[PDB]
Design a protein around this ligand. Structure first.
Ligand SMILES: [Zn+2]
Ligand SMILES: [Zn+2]
Ligand SMILES: [Zn+2]
Ligand SMILES: [Zn+2]
Ligand SMILES: [Zn+2]
Lengths: 696, 696
């Protein structure tokens, strides 16, 4: 059922967990560095878990997709073929930016954070800068112990702040990936859908120095020896059985003004979906002629497809549940209830008014803001602007450098510059530049940016072509040139005749002004947000509803049971899919082109010792009433005894609007069964070394 | 489960019946004029049943649709509005061809029929004429008692013959029909589909003379008083409950040569559907501008839509189960089996080669044969050929007149000419004549018909124009001219300058010779069919498989349980639909435009004492594993104690290929719950008088 519960809420879910079927004590779950919770790790936007004492990590194929793609070429395409390392020496690097974060400690810092903020006084921009400096100091102190990365989280609109400290493993290697047609069976057609038949798993191994301490990739590194790791279930998972997930959901918007919802549904989602579909269509068309573009843009294209389809689904779910109407009546109720409370309610009512105004302020420039951000997110302009900004930040003392441009960020920035080699083709990027220039030109006069208008020097197809022709002379196309500029100083950027550098120099003052504006709004939000969201929480509690913070990339627990759902009268979706349903979807063409060893093994009914009698087959995926979102991909699903029975990977079509308005009847997790991981690794793309190492 | 069982097979199915849940004794089901089987009646291509001691008969809406359509105009549309007669004096005639047949006696006459067949040559034609003669004399003797009609039936390819004797009620009146948006909710979109939400019901009353003998419509007639009628269940029907149907399935082809299947799959079904779709497109156009053409062509349209969709379904179901493969493979295996026992398996093997040749013979002219038959089925040419042929037969002694043209056929002949008034518009028929001439002209030259070539004046657009212009001259467009010719002698037809009559007089010698060719082809069939079919049966028995005769318009029993089915892995269709499901499909446009009163009753949860707790609503339609086919519409569904729980009306989409190859996993009846009939009559389109009459 509902709720992305923080660990600190365990006392409150202890009873519900037992009722649902958990056989572990709640204290055993409350030990976040113990067994089994200490086996759960963060990857930075996906979750994973250890599954051997020698550092083996399991997650979704779509989480490892970036790493598989970085190790792929047109001629040797691991996305297509899978990957398998017979020995740990055969493992390939997942890329310099790949990470496994192992939870060490969580600290409440709410009192100190709120004091740092209060000490700024009336000024919105100061209040932002106070919170920044507080965070920077806190994180510098916490990261004084080498090998650790820390993160500060704000919960419930700034009513609670906690600090997380994590061991930061920085040498992550790819150990195994099934073929693409298993890992992404059904592709974008089955994305966000049930029935689902997708073997969405992959394995990493985590490495540290011979001295035990995190290091970047080196052949002298050796496997990390985790304190705790998961075991595979020895009891067959069935319909109605208890399941629980712990992971790192990224963002929800369940506490939101009706106006924030209205702008999202009416403008944000449709606009983004359209832009992403336009880019898909260009890249798709060009990748058909050019297998180098197809392999280099594949991870980008996966993200665009997934987000744009998610947004289409949210819009449809909003209509199905009348989310607009719900948000309007709920807000009417909360404001009523507040007015109800005399003077005691006034601070929340005023905070509501301030939040509404700040939404209006961001709305006035939304087209400009989005269009400029995505234009500058093309590969050369993004490299130019990032690196120019770094050169500026490098002239301030580290403590005053903008988050993302501090010494602690330099490894990521450098890694990003190298990884781009596997993700960029000039003739492809050119067409994306051109799309965004043509979108820019459609902006009305008050959403335009002088610096870009002057650089374009024209408002028509010829000016667009001249600009593209100019940018095409950049040298930032090569990794070596990007790294040169990574180390160069500000005056060197300002002297350059590289046309992408020249663009970054021309626009940077405007970028910095826009950033100050966003910080100013954020500072006003810091004043109003906690007070209104505390009112929302108090109101929900007075109605007997579940109260838990919106997702914010920190560790949450959700629990419930294996069950289907009923999309329309006269039909039900069953909790499981089976091997035969995979074969039934076979067409021999992408995305429905399973490995021939799969087709043969199912035809021959080789169930590998993994058959569940109750469904007559090996299970493939299943549905459950857990409450997950983006960031939970790769989260282990645990049974009543804390054993691994699957990995979370998706939500069904109707679930996705639950980001804004939770619907219990149609909100389900889609998970890949542990038995299907094992079956694939037995019968289809064998990895007998890994099954051995997992004691199966 | 599988089986359209003859009542004589009751001993075989007694134990199966008990195991499935029948609580009546098998010998009570055996009493075909007892309780409840004696309440089941035949309408002629639909079933129905008695539901009060005053002659009330319930059947489907689409079985009553002819009658409703006959009593409808543009300016009073009963199809749209429904019909309710508050007293029996208000009931309108169903039309002169409408019948209720009440079963009186079955007789085996197999020995006699086979002797009479044998007694003929060894000439094929004489064999047909000898069976014809034998049937005619049986029927003449059986019909000698005023008020009865009799039928001879051949079962299992001519291994058994039984004679049925029926009371023939000839005055049938409409008592109630719900509005078309209930009776045909979902129209042709939901036709042949589940989930289904269609209230497919209507009521007649049966009338006899004041002496209690059958008579044609008159205001002196009085309600028939049936010896047995059905009672509504008092136990709620739920999932897994026992159900059974008795009724009159028309045709199955489950005993068939593989090439029979192939020709049907590859030629017959595709061709007929194509033709039917083309006529639909034409009539649909002309009726959207023309309310009179729309109403008058409504029943014809419904028929074309329904068969063409059925055939589209049968083709898809063939591909889904590889019907062609399964047929080929089964035929191999029974050919195998037969040579198999050499000496004694020799008559059967011979038979197969005959049947196969006969089929190649049909095949030679099949395009000619279809095109000619359908061309002559247009309204004016059909009337003129039928009427001229009647003039020719009337010159022979009645015992030698062709079946369909004897004294006993005159009522239905005369009736059809009158009913044609409600189904004919000259502008529309012209377009249909055009359509079929166009199709005739493109016959390949060896499949032309000499007389029609001549009648036409060679074959191009010009001749077609002239054809049509000429036939427009007919006076057969009026009921009265048609009846004038119903009485006229043969030389009066040959004298006529009516252009439609002149077509018939021109073409008849050909039609008679073609008929002779068919009777000859059939006679040869009469030899080989019973022997080869009896071997198909013998082989099924030896494989433990179920053995029952293909359907033949005679009374059959099917039994099983209420259950869903699973079209694809990860989903199931539930056994019931509910009121809420009807409202979810609402669009306010045809065909999803329920009565305001239904929409309001469902919004209000006014379930009228009819809610079934297990599904949380009033049931609408339900699925079960009974084995029904065309002719079974209107058949009453009975529960374990012989109470009415439903009417059969359709099959799910994947069921329909079971006409050729029975698939138990996807073959379900779709029925309308007796609770929904009651609910509609309480809350939506009320008929308190009929509810009181049925003791509910
Ligand atoms: Zn452990
Ligand atoms: Zn470096
Ligand atoms: Zn088994
Ligand atoms: Zn008459
Ligand atoms: Zn109730």
């Amino acid at each position: 059922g509902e709720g992305m519960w923080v660990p600190q809420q365990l006392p409150e879910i202890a009873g519900p967990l037992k009722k649902a079927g958990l056989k572990l004590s709640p204290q055993q779950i409350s030990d976040l560095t113990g067994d089994p919770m200490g086996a759960v790790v963060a990857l930075g936007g996906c979750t994973a878990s250890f599954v051997s004492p020698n550092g083996l990590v399991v997650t979704n194929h779509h989480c490892a997709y970036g790493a598989i793609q970085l190790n792929s070429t047109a001629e040797n395409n691991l996305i297509k073929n899978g990957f398998n390392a017979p020995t740990t020496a055969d493992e390939v690097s997942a890329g310099p930016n790949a990470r496994v974060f192992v939870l060490d400690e969580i600290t409440d810092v709410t009192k100190d954070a709120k004091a740092a903020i209060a000490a700024a006084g009336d000024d919105a921009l100061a209040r932002t800068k106070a919170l920044e400096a507080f965070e920077k100091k806190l994180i510098a102190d916490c990261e004084a112990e080498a090998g650790f990365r820390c993160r500060l989280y704000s919960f419930s609109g700034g009513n609670t702040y906690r600090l997380f400290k994590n061991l930061e493993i920085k040498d992550v290697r790819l150990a195994y990936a099934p073929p693409g047609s298993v890992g992404k069976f059904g592709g974008d057609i089955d994305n966000w859908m049930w029935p689902r038949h997708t073997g969405d798993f992959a394995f990493y191994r985590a490495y540290v120095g011979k001295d035990g301490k995190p290091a970047a990739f080196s052949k002298d590194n050796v496997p990390y020896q985790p304190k705790h790791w998961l075991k595979f279930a020895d009891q067959p998972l069935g319909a109605g059985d208890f399941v629980m997930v712990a992971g790192y959901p990224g963002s929800t918007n369940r506490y939101a003004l009706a106006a924030e919802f209205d702008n999202t549904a009416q403008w944000t989602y449709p606009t983004i979906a359209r832009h992403y579909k336009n880019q898909i269509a260009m890249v798709e068309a060009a990748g058909k002629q050019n297998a180098d573009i197809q392999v280099k843009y594949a991870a980008t294209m996966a993200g665009w497809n997934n987000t744009s389809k998610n947004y289409d689904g949210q819009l449809e779910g909003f209509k199905r549940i009348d989310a607009a109407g719900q948000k309007l009546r709920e807000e009417a109720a909360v404001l009523g209830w507040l007015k109800g409370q005399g003077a005691k309610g006034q601070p929340a009512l005023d905070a509501h008014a301030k939040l509404l105004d700040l939404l209006e302020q961001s709305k006035a420039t939304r087209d400009r803001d989005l269009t400029l951000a995505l234009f500058n997110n093309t590969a050369m302009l993004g490299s130019a602007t990032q690196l120019y900004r770094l050169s500026i930040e490098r002239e301030k003392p580290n403590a005053e450098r903008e988050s993302g441009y501090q010494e602690r960020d330099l490894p990521a920035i450098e890694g990003g510059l190298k990884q781009l080699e596997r993700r960029y083709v000039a003739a492809m990027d050119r067409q994306l530049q051109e799309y965004w220039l043509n979108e820019y030109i459609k902006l009305p006069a008050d959403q335009r940016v002088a610096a870009v208008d002057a650089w374009l020097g024209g408002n028509d197809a010829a000016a667009v072509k001249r600009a593209l022709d100019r940018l095409a002379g950049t040298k930032l196309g090569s990794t070596e040139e990007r790294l040169k500029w990574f180390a160069a100083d500000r005056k060197a950027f300002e002297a350059s005749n590289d046309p992408a550098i020249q663009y970054a120099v021309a626009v940077m003052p405007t970028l910095l002004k826009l950033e100050q504006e966003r910080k100013t709004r954020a500072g006003e939000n810091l004043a109003a947000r906690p007070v209104y969201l505390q009112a929302l929480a108090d109101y929900k509690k007075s109605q007997g509803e579940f109260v838990y913070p919106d997702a914010n990339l920190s560790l949450r627990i959700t629990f419930g049971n294996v069950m289907g759902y009923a999309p329309k009268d006269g039909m039900e979706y069953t909790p499981f899919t089976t091997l035969e349903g995979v074969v039934a979807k076979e067409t021999g063409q992408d995305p429905f082109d399973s490995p021939k060893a799969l087709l043969d093994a199912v035809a021959a009914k080789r169930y590998g010792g993994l058959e569940d009698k109750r469904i007559g087959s090996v299970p493939v995926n299943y549905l459950s009433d857990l409450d997950i979102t983006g960031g939970n991909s790769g989260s282990p699903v645990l049974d009543a005894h804390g054993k691994l029975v699957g990995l979370a990977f998706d939500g069904n079509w109707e679930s996705v609007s639950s980001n804004w308005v939770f619907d219990p009847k149609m909100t389900r997790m889609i998970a890949v069964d542990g038995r299907y991981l094992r079956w694939i690794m037995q019968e289809v793309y064998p990895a007998p070394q890994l099954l051995k190492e997992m004691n199966v």
